[PDB]
Amino acid sequence: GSSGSSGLPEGWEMRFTVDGIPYFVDHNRRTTTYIDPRTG
């Protein structure tokens, strides 16, 4: 359902692939990773 911004750091973004997988996108680093930034 409707989702917002939990609380990610600067640069780290929250998005989901066509399938709907939990992944983050970095604007500064310009990279993609599956591992969560907060948790690690």
UniProtKB/Swiss-Prot annotation:
Name assigned to this protein: E3 ubiquitin-protein ligase Itchy homolog
Function: Acts as an Acts as an E3 ubiquitin-protein ligase which accepts ubiquitin from an E2 ubiquitin-conjugating enzyme in the form of a thioester and then directly transfers the ubiquitin to targeted substrates. Catalyzes 'Lys-29'-, 'Lys-48'- and 'Lys-63'-linked ubiquitin conjugation. Involved in the control of inflammatory signaling pathways. Essential component of a ubiquitin-editing protein complex, comprising also TNFAIP3, TAX1BP1 and RNF11, that ensures the transient nature of inflammatory signaling pathways. Promotes the association of the complex after TNF stimulation.
Region of the whole protein represented: 480 to 512 of 903
PTM notes: On T-cell activation, phosphorylation by the JNK cascade on serine and threonine residues surrounding the PRR domain accelerates the ubiquitination and degradation of JUN and JUNB. The increased ITCH catalytic activity due to phosphorylation by JNK1 may occur due to a conformational change disrupting the interaction between the PRR/WW motifs domain and the HECT domain and, thus exposing the HECT domain. Phosphorylation by FYN reduces interaction with JUNB and negatively controls JUN ubiquitination and degradation. Monoubiquitinated. Autopolyubiquitinated with 'Lys-63' linkages which does not lead to protein degradation.
Cysteine disulfide links: none
Disease involvement: Autoimmune disease, multisystem, with facial dysmorphism: A disorder characterized by organomegaly, failure to thrive, developmental delay, dysmorphic features and autoimmune inflammatory cell infiltration of the lungs, liver and gut.
Limits of the WW domain: 8-39
Compartment(s) where it occurs, according to its Swiss-Prot or TrEMBL record: Cell membrane; Cytoplasm; Nucleus; Early endosome membrane
Organism in which the protein naturally occurs: Homo sapiens (Human)
Domain notes: The WW domains mediate interaction with PPxY motif-containing proteins.
Tissue expression notes: Widely expressed.
Subunit structure, interactors included: Monomer. Part of a ternary complex composed of SMAD3, ITCH/AIP4 and NEDD9/HEF1; within the complex NEDD9/HEF1 interacts (via N-terminus) with ITCH/AIP4 (via WW domains); the complex mediates ubiquitination and proteasomal degradation of NEDD9/HEF1. Interacts (via WW domains) with OCNL. Interacts (via WW domains) with NOTCH1. Interacts (via WW domains) with JUN. Interacts with JUNB; the interaction promotes ITCH-mediated ubiquitination and degradation of JUNB. (Microbial infection) Interacts with Epstein-Barr virus LMP2A.
